[PDB]
Design a protein around this nucleic acid. Structure first.
Length: 84
DNA sequence: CCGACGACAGATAATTTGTCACTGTACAGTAGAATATAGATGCGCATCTATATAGATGCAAATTGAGTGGCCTTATTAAATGACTTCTCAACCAGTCA
């Protein structure tokens, strides 16, 4: 991708600050595709004969029930001891 | 007759491509950021300038009131009016008469 910075400062492409082009919305639209079409569909290397997704789906002990989006309110931060 | 070179055919490792097994290495919070400089621009405060004088003064007409200088017939009489001055202002005795 354009604007690539290398794995460290000694390998930084000198054009990285001038050659940047993508916004966060482009990078996510590339990265999500890469994870859904390529990466989860590639071979689990320990096995050699299953995809990562195929091994996940077949590896569930049972199909879990989807949790309600409201019940993810367990994500809300707690203030423990404020007084009325 | 003997030796050298070309045509055609045949066999072959070098080259390239593909497949397969073993492996060094990055994933591990991290370079946008700090520190000088020149150069232009803008707001504020001071430091002059040039204009604008009205009040005071000097002077020169313009009367203005107040001076001063120069030029002029006279003698008798009479009347009138108004004045001034002077003078004067006794009292009983002696001689007639109806």
């Amino acid at each position: 991708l354009p604007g690539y910075t290398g794995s460290n400062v000694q390998e930084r492409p000198e054009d990285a600050e001038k050659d940047a082009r993508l916004t966060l919305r482009e990078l996510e639209q590339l990265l999500v595709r890469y994870i859904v079409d390529r990466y989860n569909q590639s071979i689990d290397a320990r096995m050699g004969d299953q995809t990562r997704f195929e091994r996940w789906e077949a590896g569930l002990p049972t199909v879990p029930v989807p949790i309600p989006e409201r019940d993810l309110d367990i994500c809300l931060m707690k203030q423990s001891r404020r007084t009325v």
